[PDB]
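Q: For a teaching session next week I want to show students how multiple molecules come together into a single three-dimensional assembly. I've collected the sequence lines for a complex. Could you give me the predicted structure tokens for the whole thing so I can convert them for display?
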Amino acid sequence: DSSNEALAGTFVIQTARLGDDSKLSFIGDQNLINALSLATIQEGENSET
Amino acid sequence: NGVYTTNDRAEIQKEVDQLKEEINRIASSTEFNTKKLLNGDSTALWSSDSSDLDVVIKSAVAEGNYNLNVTVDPGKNFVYKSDVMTLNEDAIGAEIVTA
Amino acid sequence: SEKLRGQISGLKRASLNAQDGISLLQTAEGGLQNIQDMLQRMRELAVQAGNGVYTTNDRAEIQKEVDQLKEEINRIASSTEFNTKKLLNGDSTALWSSD
Amino acid sequence: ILMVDQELAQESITKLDKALETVSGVRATIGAQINRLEYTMTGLDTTREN
Amino acid sequence: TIKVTDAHTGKFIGSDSVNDSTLRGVIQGVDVKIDSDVGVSISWNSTKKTMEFSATGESEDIKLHLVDNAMEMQIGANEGQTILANIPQVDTTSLGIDD
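A: Of course. Below is the structure for the complete assembly, covering every listed component.
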């Protein structure tokens, strides 16, 4: 509860890099992409150097 | 525009990548008396020891060696979520058999 | 000169994009015309029933045709297509799911 | 530069515009140098004659 | 009586009391329909020969997933200049003549 895994029967996708380097794009057939129907819940931020 | 599916954009991207390779080739192809002009061989000459540091040349450089000190404060990452999955009606159901 | 040339290219591209946009709306308009045409026949067949001389069997006879017209209207609602993009079946605005 | 989804074309346009600006600046600089050299050409011949 | 909240933080969004069991006009642009056989207990009274209904006494949770997917068309030669279009969903259920 009250975390990223509050919903059952869903896929959670995370990456181990930060910033704009961590954006992922999905390409494929229209029906499969529509069935998957991904959504964005967290967007990355850059760092301070 | 949206009239194109997710395949037309990839078909565009393929030949765009081809054009990128062609422009890199023409950038690195110029030559005169075995002395390259455009690939930063007329202004500066640089090198580094670590394999994660890049240098781009714009104007006159000075000289010498340098030592760098790096401190980092991190940001965040990207997190995606999918949809919900459900079983079809033809399935589901328990029973008693004798095999 | 370079800026003007780029603007000219962009203008021509947008000029084509407009009509590639408009065709889809024309198709949707046609489909909606057909559906509206069927609904009025359903209304007239509904209003015919009600004058009481009819027994309790020809009313079910009318109900058969009403149901069959309803499944026709569902089929035409779910059959619209353009470039593998279904328009009228709620596939242009949102996408919902539950468990 | 990527064009896979309907979100990167705007950034692509901006990058292309600024790249064109940079190329134009380089060509202007080279033209300036060649014009200066062309002007300094003829004085040598005039001084040779004198 | 229906109360809707967020699934990750818990900010209250809306509450409603309906009679025909349709949640309308609290979530932007969506109407939600729920079955009438949700959380009700049935028992029989032989001494009075009548059925009796009652509340279960415990709450029930359903979770909903919804993602936007409007229509964007490029109309200009620069950024920001885009047009948004939507097509509402139409069928027998939406038109309210399903039953």
